[PDB]
Design a binder for this molecule. Structure first.
Ligand SMILES: Nc1nc2c(ncn2[C@@H]2O[C@H](COP(=O)(O)OP(=O)(O)NP(=O)(O)O)[C@@H](O)[C@H]2O)c(=O)[nH]1
Ligand SMILES: [Mg+2]
Length: 166
């Protein structure tokens, strides 16, 4: 069946794993558990199309400066996640987008910008801010909460539809 190779990238601690686990297992993991490299495969029906989502959960930590290219090279779509309460993670977004363009030798690659942790009150990254950025990249912006599950499916299905239009 149709398969979609998705990759979730972004700074450590932003909630990459929590988003992915909400999707696949429907439940919030509120604990410290740094990722090295995790892979998830689930069968789903998106807009009537039966398909297999092959998801690669990456490590936010520096030291995996090498195995970064390898996964960015085979991935068809990327969820670039930052945390709305972490300015640094938001700024690092540019850096991840560039590595993806470099590795795939392409300016337009299926991508979605994801502002996670929208359930928190202490917001340091305004929404219009992220929206302008997304607008200049020519990509969609979606705020999520792996905590309450808001916008989680939205984020993933949208990425899929972007790959579909590519
Ligand atoms: N309040 C709130 N906390 C969240 C949310 N998403 C993740 N977290 C919390 O943030 C911490 C890190 O989340 P995790 O998913 O492990 O982050 P990561 O980006 O995958 N880290 P790493 O890159 O090291 O693998 C956890 O304690 C988790 O519960 C969210 O939407 N809201
Ligand atoms: Mg993780």
């Amino acid at each position: 069946m149709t398969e979609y190779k998705l990759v979730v990238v972004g700074a450590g601690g932003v909630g990459k794993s929590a988003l992915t686990i909400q999707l696949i297992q429907n439940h919030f993991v509120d604990e410290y558990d740094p990722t090295i490299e995790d892979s998830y495969r689930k069968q789903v029906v998106i807009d009537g199309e039966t398909c297999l989502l092959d998801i690669l959960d990456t490590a936010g930590q520096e030291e995996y400066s090498a195995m970064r290219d390898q996964y960015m090279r085979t991935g068809e779509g990327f969820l670039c996640v930052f945390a709305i309460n972490n300015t640094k993670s938001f700024e690092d977004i540019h850096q991840y987008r560039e590595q993806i363009k470099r590795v795939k030798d392409s300016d337009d690659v299926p991508m979605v910008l994801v502002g996670n942790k929208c359930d928190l009150a202490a917001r340091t990254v305004e929404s219009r801010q992220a929206q302008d950025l997304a607008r200049s990249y020519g990509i969609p912006y979606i705020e999520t909460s792996a905590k309450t599950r808001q916008g989680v499916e939205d984020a993933f299905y949208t990425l899929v539809r972007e790959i579909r239009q590519h």
